[PDB]
Amino acid sequence: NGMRPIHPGEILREEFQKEMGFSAAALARALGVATPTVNNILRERGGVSADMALRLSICLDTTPEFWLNLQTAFDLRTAEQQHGDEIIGSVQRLVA
Amino acid sequence: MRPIHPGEILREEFQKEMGFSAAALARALGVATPTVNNILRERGGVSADMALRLSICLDTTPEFWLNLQTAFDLRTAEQQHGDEIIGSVQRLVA
């Protein structure tokens, strides 16, 4: 298929939210961002930016790489799933 | 630590080394020459799609490029909005 893309919002929701019990608005206030931004990420609609990842790391006690690496892994897995065969068929390696 | 754009690594460690033109790279990548130039000139970032293309083309992993991009964006964010971020975020209370 292969392995399912994991949106950072899934981690935010399943591992942080489900346990700590915060609302979207509560998280937003602590992040210093607007609630709709948080709403987008939790619903896995919007990605995590460098600014957001820094905010999350302070707010939830993580590194900011944790979040951006989740984002790029998701984005890569998605690009592979969506465009992987087309890319493999159209790119030539360059050794000189 | 100041930021390193992935395009600098593409330009200095691959282009300068192997001596290809921007156009030759774009042809091999299956993309437009201005798309390559925007990275080489450090005006734009490397997307997942571009990272995949580069990885095939230059025998790298795609993560190699994305992690360079992630590092650049974080370092940049910290350098320009770090104080603003520290001043506006509170540890969430469980």
Residue numbers in the entry:
A (entry chain A): 4 to 99
B (entry chain D): 6 to 99
Question: Paper's wording?
Answer:
GraTA (Growth rate affecting Toxin–Antitoxin) is a type II TA module recently discovered in Pseudomonas putida. By sequence similarity, GraTA is most closely related to the higBA TA family. Here we show that GraA does not contain unstructured regions and forms a globular dimer while the toxin GraT contains an N-terminal intrinsically disordered region that is key for transcriptional regulation of the graTA operon as well as for the RNase activity of GraT. GraA binds tightly to the graTA operator and GraT prevents this interaction through steric interference from its N-terminal disordered region.
The protein was completely traced and, in contrast to other antitoxins, does not contain an intrinsically unfolded domain. Helix α5 extends over seven turns to form a dimerization unit and its C-terminus (after a kink) also caps over the globular domain of the other monomer. The dimerization interface of GraA2 is mainly stabilized by hydrophobic interactions. The helix-turn-helix DNA binding motif, comprising residues from 25 to 45, presents a positively charged surface. The separation between the two HTH motifs in the dimer, measured as the distance between the centers of mass of both α3 helices, is 33.8 Å. The closest homolog with known structure for GraA is C. burnetti HigA (backbone root-mean-square deviation (RMSD) of 2.6 Å for residues 4–99 when superimposing monomers). In contrast with most antitoxins, GraA is a fully ordered protein and, in accordance with that, is also uncommonly stable and not degraded by Lon or Clp20.
